[PDB]
Design a protein around this ligand. Structure first.
Ligand code: NA
Length: 179
């Protein structure tokens, strides 16, 4: 807030790696500081780590919340997901709050990786993959208010079909794994 734009996400997910087949709808609040690219990375994370208990957090608009999280019925964090370029301090402290920490990084990572990767060696179950900028820009550009994606996940590759065709998202793993 504001302009805090409301988007509706309609996801048909066919995840052949996990045997997950769902049609899901989510409402997402887009903070004015959240770019279309950032939101799109959050949507990819949602599909990539889908669970009925996975929810969008307040992301960049609230320092105490992640971009996405999966909580137990007792409100404890099973999975803490960030997007973008959080620093090693944030990863360290958040990772203590959860059994699994994931980051979908994006943007130019040369300076960031050099600072963060050496500093998180001792962290427990932190997993970091980068989204390539070319496909991200294609996916994110001029995002409509109702986002309809068909997503197929096969051999670790994410194929997103939208209104402009089928786009192949090949994540670069920096540390850890999808799980
Ligand atoms: Na968007």
């Amino acid at each position: 807030a504001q302009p805090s734009t409301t988007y509706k996400f309609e996801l048909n997910l066919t995840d052949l790696d996990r045997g997950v087949y769902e049609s899901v709808k989510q409402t997402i609040a887009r903070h004015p500081s959240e770019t279309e690219e950032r939101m799109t990375v959050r949507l990819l994370a949602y599909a990539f780590w889908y669970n009925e208990q996975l929810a969008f957090g307040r992301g960049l608009s609230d320092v105490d919340e992640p971009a996405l999280w999966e909580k137990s019925l007792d409100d404890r964090v099973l999975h803490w997901i960030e997007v973008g370029q959080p620093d090693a301090d944030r990863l360290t402290w958040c990772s203590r709050r959860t059994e699994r920490t994931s980051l979908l990084a994006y943007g130019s990572l040369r300076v960031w990786e050099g600072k963060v990767i050496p500093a998180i060696k001792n962290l427990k179950n932190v997993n970091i993959a980068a989204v390539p900028q070319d496909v991200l820009e294609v996916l994110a550009k001029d995002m409509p208010r109702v986002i309809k994606w068909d997503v197929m996940i096969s051999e670790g590759t994410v194929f997103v079909t939208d209104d402009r065709g089928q786009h192949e998202v090949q994540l670069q793993w920096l540390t850890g794994e999808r799980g």
